Write a structure and sequence with these properties.
part of a larger assembly, 2 chains, A: 49 residues, B: alpha+beta, EC 2.7.7.6 (chain B), DNA binding (chain B), DNA-directed RNA polymerase (chain B), transcription (chain B)
């Protein structure tokens, strides 16, 4: 081998349906659907979840 | 038989937060109109947002400038929260140039006459060196909803300039919409309700113009339903 050329690729992956995003206590699960902000349940304050 | 809801006092708890109330609303229209307006506001409102960032010194998102206390990534993540409005034109290019030590804030940006920074204490970054100087060119444009990092690159077929920084533009001027239906008392008849909407926005839209935009969009949607084409 004469020379080594290493190139580093950076990808910024965003969470999306299928990502096994799991809780701390043994909770599991995949991202079901990205439903919009205003379709989220909201309290009396109107704060979505 | 049906009265028409009327705009009454639109109080300002703050620049961000405002209460808009509709007094003469008939039975069976409180929660209906409330949901209507809330969905329209959170779903479709024009808003000004940062799309492209051009920092003079750094070459890419993960390359960190000498002198600053923050990664260029964190600088972009703060630039997202820039509360800016433009009403003279659709797309503008703000310029920021600051040297010396101290917290580089939004107020330091060279503003034009058509651009307003409604949050002129927004800490963009921290410059921690006398020699170090930060030079930003920030593209702020109008839009709706949320445009994740995947689309405008197809409007130009790859970012031909290098060192350009692409940012998830979140144009939503509003962040909280809530409606409450309360028993309003007026001399006319006996059963009417205040529709009181709390709206927390980024200070870039007036509550009156916001509700007017929402109502106009809803009316345009109901245009087809008023007159069924088949």
């Amino acid at each position: 081998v004469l020379k080594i050329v290493k190139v580093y690729l950076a990808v910024k992956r965003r969470i999306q349906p299928g990502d096994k995003m799991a809780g701390r206590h043994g909770n599991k699960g995949v991202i079901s659907k990205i439903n919009p902000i205003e379709d989220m349940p909201y309290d009396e304050n109107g704060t979505p979840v | 038989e049906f009265l028409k809801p009327r705009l009454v006092d639109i109080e300002q708890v703050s620049s961000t937060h405002a209460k808009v109330t509709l007094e003469p609303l008939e039975r069976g229209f409180g929660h209906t109109l409330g949901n209507a307006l809330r969905r329209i506001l959170l779903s479709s409102m024009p808003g000004c947002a940062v799309t492209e960032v051009e920092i003079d010194g750094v070459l890419h998102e993960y390359s960190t400038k000498e002198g600053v206390q923050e990664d260029i990534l964190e600088i972009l993540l703060n630039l997202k929260g820039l509360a800016v409005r433009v009403q003279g034109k659709d797309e503008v290019i703000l310029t920021l140039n600051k040297s010396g030590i101290g917290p580089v804030t939004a107020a330091d940006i060279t503003h034009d006459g058509d651009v307003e920074i409604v949050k002129p204490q927004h800490v963009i970054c921290h410059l921690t060196d006398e020699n170090a100087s930060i030079s930003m060119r920030i593209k702020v444009q109008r839009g709706r909803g949320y445009v994740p990092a995947s689309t405008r690159i197809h409007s130009e077929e790859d970012e031909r300039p290098i060192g350009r920084l692409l940012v998830d533009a979140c144009y939503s001027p509003v962040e909280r919409i809530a409606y409450n239906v309360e028993a309003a008392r007026v001399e006319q008849r006996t059963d009417l309700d205040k529709l009181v909407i709390e709206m927390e926005t980024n200070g870039t839209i007036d509550p009156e113009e916001a509700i007017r935009r929402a109502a106009t969009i809803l009316a345009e949607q109901l245009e087809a339903f008023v007159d069924l084409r088949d």
